[PDB]
Amino acid sequence: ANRSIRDGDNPELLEERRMATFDTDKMAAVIYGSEEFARRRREITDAVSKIPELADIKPYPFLTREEKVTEGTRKISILTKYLNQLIDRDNEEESLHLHREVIGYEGHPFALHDALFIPTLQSQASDEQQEKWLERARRREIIGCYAQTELGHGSNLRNLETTAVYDIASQEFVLHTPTTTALKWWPGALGKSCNYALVVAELNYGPHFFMVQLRDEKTHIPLKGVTVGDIGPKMNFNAADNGYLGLNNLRVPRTNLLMRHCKVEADGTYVKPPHAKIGYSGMVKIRSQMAMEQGLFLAHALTIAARYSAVRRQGHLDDKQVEVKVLDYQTQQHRLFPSLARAYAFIFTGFETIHLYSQLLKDVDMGNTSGMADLHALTSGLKSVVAHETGEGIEQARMACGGHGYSMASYISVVYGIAIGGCTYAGENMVMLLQLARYLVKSVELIKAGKAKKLGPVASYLADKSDETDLTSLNGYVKMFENMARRQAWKATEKFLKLMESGESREVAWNKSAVELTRASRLHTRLFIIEAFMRRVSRIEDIPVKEVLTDLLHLHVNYELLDVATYALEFMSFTQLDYVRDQLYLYLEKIRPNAVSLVDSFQISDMQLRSVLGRRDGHVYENLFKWAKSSPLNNADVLPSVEKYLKPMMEKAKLAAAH
């Protein structure tokens, strides 16, 4: 029962939707975590579709950079008016659906306000201070931003140049931007949108958070001591204004310092915040979240690609009278379905880490940590592998559309440009793979120390070493996938040890083995991704849904295993390698008739998809032409530039001498 079937649909897609071996309302429920929310997405989408001003002013690719900032600002101010009609404002699941559909991904004045400004106020500012700002934030009375990275520093928060000196005479922090590289650089909404910022600065006590008003609340003119502006065009996310901040001995009250965990008293005593580095909690929320987000990004690209694949006919197989849908080719299925399997896998992996963090957030209001450290390390590699493999799959989804995928009419290049930033923001991907490697070394540096009973369930499989082998029913793959991770974990570990056993200093001994350590993190991460996927599948009550999700899961483990055979061949035969190589191509064929249904299940409205190639109704060619015909260069037959330059250049070129 494909629920994305409508009248007037392209038969090419219709005949693909009648092939649905499951209910897509059922699958949406699984995808978005509950039957109730999956419904609410459709209700909201329907509620929005009946509000004309919430439509894109024109096709978003047709807009200039400034026209993009305007429209995102236009759309965010209108959305905010209707917001409390359409959703439960404090329901993040709904608010994300509403904004991802209505605003889009390219940015808006409130992006980082909701992404990091509010979540940090929730996890770092005293109940006193939350009363002063947190609801003013949620009421969008003010626009905030998370202002941490500097022009010279982003990855090493131990050497930020921005200063926060306390002057006990007047009980104020003087916040300064000493050097040019000390300038805040990259915070969303810092340059033009926000009038408040959470500025990270050196207190020497390390980096802390300071609420700083940047612009006057009524006039939006910057306050004395404030230099602010945009940082120019970017790879993408250009509807958002990422900016810089210059602070010239800026004075803020002592109580503009966030103090949930730490304290500075009026006389200047500093109460060290419980322990750990609790202030990095905001980053951890994002990192735990983007396994879900980059999962949905990927789903978006595949939704376009899969649908278009089922429409585009090119080349013949058998039957030399009608060309075949390109989705019938093995390479096509190969370059799409594993990534489709990944989309589901990353999202299920996302639900576990999302709940893990919102649970290990309450653990931090009790004096509990170290579930903190165990979560950080996991999401460290998780955001890295996921964003990297997502980016790979999106381009594959783009290129899979042939020539037209390169057109903005596909919109896959936008989804890539947005998503791929996840390989940089919220921690540089290499660095974050290394952070996880520090949790892996520790988990191994324990062999002669015993302490195997201290390991968490995530690291448990390390203090084992019970290889074996086999792969006749799923869990053997998982077993193989621990065996791979384990080996590389020890091997890379013992190599960093050996270079200390021969006396190269720790940090240099750490550097010489940096690549193997990252190789470990990825193997460990992809092991977890599989397990979470498995855990979600075996819970499903509806049998046809469990069935097709099993097909996806079989496809995952074999494509994944073969991508990492270089590590899997300590434990495998070469004949078994051709099994999983044959198994891969079996479930490609198995998935095929469900392909369109599997992406229809995500129930991404056309308003959110923003894709001509990926239109739900499948009327691609007719509307691709309309899209092109209405594009801005087609405003004039003979271009003003041609008349001015090319016409003279040609007249002149006819008269020139033959040398």
Next chain:
Amino acid sequence: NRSIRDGDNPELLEERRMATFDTDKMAAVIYGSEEFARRRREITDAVSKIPELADIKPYPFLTREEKVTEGTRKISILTKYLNQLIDRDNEEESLHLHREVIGYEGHPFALHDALFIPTLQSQASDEQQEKWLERARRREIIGCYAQTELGHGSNLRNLETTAVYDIASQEFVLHTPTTTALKWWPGALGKSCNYALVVAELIIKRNNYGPHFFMVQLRDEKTHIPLKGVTVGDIGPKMNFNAADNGYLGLNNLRVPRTNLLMRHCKVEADGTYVKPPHAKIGYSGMVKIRSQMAMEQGLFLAHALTIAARYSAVRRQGHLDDKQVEVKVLDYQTQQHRLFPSLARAYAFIFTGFETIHLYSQLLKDVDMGNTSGMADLHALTSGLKSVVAHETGEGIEQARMACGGHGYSMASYISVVYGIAIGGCTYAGENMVMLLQLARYLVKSVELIKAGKAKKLGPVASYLADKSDETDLTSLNGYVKMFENMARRQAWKATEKFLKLMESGESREVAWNKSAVELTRASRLHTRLFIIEAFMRRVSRIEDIPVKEVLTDLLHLHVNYELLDVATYALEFMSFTQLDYVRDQLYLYLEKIRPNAVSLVDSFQISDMQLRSVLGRRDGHVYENLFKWAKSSPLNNADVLPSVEKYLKPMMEKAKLAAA
């Protein structure tokens, strides 16, 4: 290090003082000759004296229409200065001049030079060359290669644009019957060209002869208004290449003379007599020129990206090593050397691989001028996989180059995103990568399918290694690596062929048998071309005098063959131990550390001017932070302190929210 200047950032100055070779010598190698390498600097110098040839403003700041305008502004000016600055019919020099002055984002004459002119050269009669080819070269007229339709790009056997000969008036009637039949994607088709080489199915009193080339005038040479029967426009914004106008073409029973059919190789006489061309597929010659060429070109884009990454990696200090005062240069980190230098090894490897296929194309272009065209099929298949693997790996490389700059890499001030957007199209144009990998796979089957027969002596030198057997395998000295790459390849080649064969002994039809083995066959193709890239590299370094250059290129080459071998270890473990895998793994890291001090020198050698580089992070002088600020401050969004859209939307929104109920 010839890229050292006064006023340079000491960060980069101390990196260039570490040069263990001459960069004027390396440049000569990269560009194929000392004479040309010298010309590049000579042209760049002469260009730098002409103010009108500078970018009107930082290209990222430009709207899509302003980009078309600027490509048109700069190409009309450049055309005037063309005879001063270079030898017009020297393609090496013209490419340097345009890649630097114009750039990669497109101009009215891109495909005019890329395919329009090369197709006239290879497919038009001496008569027809007299009528147009010199007109094209003097840029009297603007042309294009109009092949791909809205519904057909890969499969040329079923294009819907017809070419019907009417013997009565001796004309071809050219028709676009359906909306999908519309030409779609030719550069300059929509707005710039007034002439187009239109590919259409040839019809002679219902006889179907396949796709052919027809010269079509589209716009009046005087008014640039389209002619009767012509529909033409732009196909909208794109992932990149947006200073160019890629267009669509609609033809309504457009009549052109019989002699607007490109003849040479083939003929249509006034009575309708069709004369078959010698080798059926002589017409795709324009495509093969591109494919042969982009190993070179997708070698240079990548170098361009690395020129920015490496330089910036030697400025950007972040994190601490041993000395816990003063942060370390990020280029010192292993992951950074690992995510950068192998691509640097590929950039060199691709370019040298490019020199070989460029030269034998333009010589197996003379083989097509009277006689044997056996090295036509052998070249097509080589360049089929070569463009696919190269463009794909150049893609991964260039993204790695961007992310290497961290946060700032995402900014347009790095320009690596542009370079990525431009080159990655190479995975699509000039043949869809999967389709092209499958094309070489057919040449691999047929090459294998010649050895259970006894025609191994029909094999070319490229395919030769397939009839052999290496069995015994080691390294210790390079040639053993090539021997290892001869395996895997040969291994998979047979392994994939016999699977496709078995499916036919299963009685599954060829097309379906081919389809079910399609992935294995592409694995075979990739392995084959990676072997070639390595050999090509080898043949270039073991040939040149100047030992410092031959030694740094040997360092690169060692890094290549070790990094590549590990990337394909899964195939290399039919022939290797495991302990040797740790050697090649150890060997990889040794040459990362060995290359490191030459890093800035190896890229400075490409002698890409700032004018061409168009990157703030990649500035030659190395003044990044100072100029990154200046750049941002000048960016268009900062024209006002309070945005018009903030005053109009955000201010009233905020007022309302404060007053609104709880």
